[PDB]
Design a protein around this ligand. Sequence first.
Ligand SMILES: O=C(O)CCC(=O)C(=O)O
Ligand SMILES: [Fe+3]
Ligand SMILES: [Mg+2]
Ligand SMILES: [Mg+2]
Length: 265
Amino acid sequence: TNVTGDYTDCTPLLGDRAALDSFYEEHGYLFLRNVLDRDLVKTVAEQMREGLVALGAADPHATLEELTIDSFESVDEVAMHDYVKYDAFWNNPSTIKVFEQVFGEPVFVFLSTTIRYYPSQAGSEEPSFHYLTPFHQDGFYIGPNQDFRTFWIPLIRTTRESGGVALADGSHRRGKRDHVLNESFRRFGHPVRGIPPTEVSEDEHLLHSPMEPGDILLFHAHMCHKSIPNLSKDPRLMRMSMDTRVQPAKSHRGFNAMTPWTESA
Ligand SMILES: O=C(O)CCC(=O)C(=O)O
Ligand SMILES: [Fe+3]
Ligand SMILES: [Mg+2]
Ligand SMILES: [Mg+2]
C-alpha cells in the first residue's frame, strides 16, 4: 500500500484557534473525531440504504454492515440524490456549529454534494475501480475562489481495507497542479484527468485512517487526494460516504457552490 500513515487526530486542537489554524496551514487537513450527531449520521446512512434497496437490488433485510450491491455503476445516481437528504444534514444546527468551529466565522454550505456507495471487490480478478477518483485537487474543478474546504464524512465506519480518501500530507502549498488524462479512470463512460505520479512528492506522505460515523475529515482546495478502493474481506463492508464543500459566508459563491449535483453532472 502507498498509504504510509494515519491522519493525525486533530480533535485535541478544537478550543485553540491558533493551534488549529497552524496545523491546518502546515498540513492542509483536519481530522475531527465524534463531532457530528451520530443519530443524524445514522439517519442519512439509512436513507442511502433504502435508496439501494429501491435502486441497487440491495437485500431489504440486510443491516448496514451486511449490506452489499453488485455494481456501483448500475445504480441510478440521479435517483439516489432524491433518497439521501444531505442538505438537511449539512444545515442542521449541530453540523453548522462544527463548520463554524473550523472556519471561525459563519459559513455557506455548497448546494452540491457527492454521495458514494462502493461495494467491496476483494477477490475480483478484473475489478471495476475506474469510477474512483485519481489524485486531484478540488480547487482544480471548483472556483474561482479557493478558500472553500472539502468536508468528507463516513456514513458507516471505514476500515483500512474498505477505503475512503487518501491525503497527500502538506501537498496544498504549491498551488494548483497539472491534471492529465488517465486511461484507467472514467466517469459516466467519459475520460478523467488526474495528477500524474511525477507531480506528487514522496515527501507529501499519504495518509488514511479508519473513521467512525460522527467523524469528519476536511481539507484545503489544493490538497492532493485520491480514492482508496474497497478491498474489504474481514469483514466485507460497503464504503458509504458523502462529501461537500463549505466556505466563509462572506466569500464569492461560484457555480459549484450554487448548483446541485444533478443539475451540473
Ligand atoms: O471518497 C472518495 O473516493 C473521493 C473523495 C473526494 O475526492 C472528495 O471528497 O473531494
Ligand atoms: Fe475531491
Ligand atoms: Mg435474508
Ligand atoms: Mg498557495
